[PDB]
Amino acid sequence: TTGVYRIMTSYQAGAGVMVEGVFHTLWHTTKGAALMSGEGRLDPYWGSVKEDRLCYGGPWKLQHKWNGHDEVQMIVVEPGKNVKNVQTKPGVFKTPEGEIGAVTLDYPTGTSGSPIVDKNGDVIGLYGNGVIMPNGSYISAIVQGER
Amino acid sequence: ETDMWIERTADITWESDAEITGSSERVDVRLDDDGNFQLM
């Protein structure tokens, strides 16, 4: 069922989103372990360790990306708490393959895989693969690929 | 056997009342082959 999910193992290992019958998360939250669900066991369909992305049940369905103009929201899936959204204007990680939108939001480990959404409520990527700055501040990429 | 599972918790939506927070930083990074971003 389409929506935002917690990944459990009890304690929360991460989060992700079901869209068009496919479950999407960061690779590192499960490392490709199968996932039990209300619809039976889900098996990893495609994953990239380099990109830290993983989907179950079929190919990557998330087709939208940050437009480079607008603020975005993270649906923060904090362990032990109802979800709450936070809004921010991304900066960027500057890499050779183009800029990647990046958010200065610092939440607990159980939150990796929480979705980032645009104003239309479309998922433009996931939280939780980034860098620690020399001053200790955390910045995550908006982690995304093509559908 | 796996010891992991998923639990649905919320709709995918934009919240009109969300707190605005954070900053727009610009940082040079490379992504290594095991998926770790590295500061440059």
């Binding site: 590192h28 830290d52 480990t109 159980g110 990796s112 939780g128 693969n129 980034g130 620690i132 | -």
Partner: peptide
């Protein structure tokens, strides 16, 4: 650290 670098991931969440």
């Amino acid at each position: 650290l670098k991931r969440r």
